[model samples]
Target: DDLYRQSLEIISRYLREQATGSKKPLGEAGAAGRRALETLRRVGDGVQRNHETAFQGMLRKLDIKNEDDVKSLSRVMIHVFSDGVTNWGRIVTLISFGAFVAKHLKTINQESCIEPLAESITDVLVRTKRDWLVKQRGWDGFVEFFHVE
Candidate 1:
């Protein structure tokens, strides 16, 4: 808890500094920041709810009730999260991977099944969106670029 609070304080201070140092006029940047922050809050809320529901659904769909089953899925989840993939993309890939494994295993599956789907999805995302993501997140402001969509 202390570490979390300290982290939040550090982030808050950094954001404050960035905002104050922006070249844009105060009125414009303040309003834009407010709007962007509100939108981000809403999006974050939706993402959190969606992730919880989807996670539950995946567990149910895969019929994971035993320690072994839990461990198997946990391994997949840990790997996926560790890869630094985006959240929305992670959920989609996880569900799709779960379905694929369920189809193949029918009753029992191994952790080995996770890698192929994760790799394929990562490959497709990198191939299709790498340049676009770099451009949008680089020259264009991150929040502004995303908000335009």
Candidate 2:
């Protein structure tokens, strides 16, 4: 009990320092500092509650139960986020390359341009299709594990 009391006193002193922005004794001028700290704590609690609400909503939507389940999904989610950006870049580059090839070919009336444009489009389509397949696979894993029907 004595140790606890000492610890509490130390903590109180620390909080007072933080609230006052210094260790100097407030005497009578610390009311504003105390009020500021209280207001900040309230706002921080509100933000924390909002985030908790969001987390619960996500858990309900995903039918997630345990931390491992969330970890599994997180792994896939990180991959999806990364791959989505990369695939988008690939698509844009392929389409632009295709258009450029087509434009240049049109000027030259070269029949060979069709092949390169087709290849570019094919390349983009293949990658996009692969991404879709991977996403489907991930979703299937989720459903199977959670028995989401």
Candidate 3:
């Protein structure tokens, strides 16, 4: 939960800065950075929630039949999502998704369904980002056009 809380703080800071746009003493470049950070934080949250739900569903599919499994999976899921964009395109999000699925595959009885499970996860991810991951890489990519430096 600390990770999520920290992300919230980062986003909150961006929002606060963004609210001072145009009227703030800062120049055009500073205002642009504020906007970029704000959009990144927003996209970060969206990516986080999307990964959380998808990986949780993956865990369920692996038939994690106990409380511990759920808890372990949840912790890993949250950490992965919370740290997703720390490096400005880190693929950890996708890696974590794979790891989540792999964890259950190792413990489950049905191994043959692994391929289908993977395909389904990929499908959902593609659908979720149909317009971004598929089209323009979301607001972060779009906002780059406005970058003054």
Candidate 4:
């Protein structure tokens, strides 16, 4: 959890600084930013799968069978993402995790769970840095970052 938080902070700081033009581009940050971005992106991709398994395990361990239990879990999840510096990676994690939980809730027909989760997710999205290279540089910039152009 500490590692996750630190990793998220690094990614978030990078994005925020980049947006302000106060930091060098990822490639220009020597190998540091590029390496970090690659490592984190890979981790983020894998997290989508791991999150589900982890959530299920958590549910079983906590025996979350009531609305209050779900609310508590949602609060914890929201706090994890919002407790510290907001950044791209953290926002992505929040969005991903919320969606993951929402999907599971839908599967089990827990409609009430969706609203609070969606509200928290939406709040974080609004509160976090919404503009980055994609917003700043447009599609060409996006393609440039991905090397897809």
Candidate 5:
């Protein structure tokens, strides 16, 4: 439980930096975080490209800029996972889409929402896919699942 929470702290805070402003790729930990983000972004590269429309569409269902927006978006994340075969691709879609929402919040001067939204995304993924994720050793499996030879 704490591992994903701890790891997602890496993911979300990193996204927060990128979402907020410049790409400040700092320390060893920072670089590892960037590695994590890059991996996830590309893991869903297919969705990052094609499925952005679906993500945009989901946000379009209701304007996302506040607490209720987090609630609704989190709900949508759950439904998306439930609506189909809950797999890793779909999980990345949710995270990257959450990344998308973080940026939108920053753009709209709702930066505070990013933390809550990140929390929502973390909760959704961990809640829905706890077994799957744990089996994969959580997010660390992403680095293991595919790595440069």
Candidate 6:
């Protein structure tokens, strides 16, 4: 029911454990993650869409029904997300990829794979992006740093 929030909280703990010079760790980091998901609702919030021209290679392999892929691709996406910036762009980059795969799963009529794939991507995010996430204030700062109205 709260996949996104659950995802956020997973990474949120990682945010606390790794010191990205965050100085003080949050006492109840889960609360911080919940806030992040709330802010996330406003990002690509209404669209829930990605371009057909975008990430094409990533989606092409899943043409068959009731099937999906992510293990290796998830690695590529994490690198893709935080590649050349120290910006709050990580959340958008990371979250966008989830949307991409989720769409493919849903399109194939195998919605069962959707949340599980998300759970995978979520762990990968926390696994790889914790320090960066702590630096960016646990996703709460992502929307604001990116300058949205």
Best by lDDT: 5
lDDT of 4 by residue, 83-106 (tens): 656445555566456545655665
Kindly report which residue stretches of model 3 are placed more than 4 angstroms away from their true locations once superposed.
Answer: 1-95, 136-149
Rate residue 25 of model 6 by lDDT: 35
Pairs in clash, predicted candidate 6: none
Q: Which window of ten consecutive residues has the lowest lDDT sum in model 1?
A: 2-11
Instruction: Give a tens-digit lDDT track for model 2, residues 1-149.
Output: 33223222322333333333344332332553343334333433344354555444544565433333323443323333355464433332333333333333444454343443343344334443555535534223222332322
lDDT (10s digit) by residue, model 3, range 34-138 = 575555545544554678877687656655544444334443433433633333343335534544454455455444434443343344334333444435443
RMSD of 2: 28.5
lDDT for model 2: 0.37
Candidate 4 least-lDDT 10 residues: 136-145
Model 4 CA deviation exceeding 4 Å by range = 1-46, 82-85, 124-149
Models 1 onward score TM values of 0.28, 0.27, 0.31, 0.45, 0.81, 0.59
TM-score of 2: 0.27
Model 4 clash number = 0
Across 1-149, the per-residue lDDT of candidate 5 in tens digits comes to: 57556666755765585576554553434565567666765665566567778768877887876877777776577876776687666776777787778878888888888887878788877777788878887656766665566
Over 4 Å off, model 5: 24-34, 44-46
**Which segments of model 1 are wrong by more than 4 Å?**
1-107, 138-149
**By lDDT: ranked, best first:** 5, 6, 4, 3, 1, 2
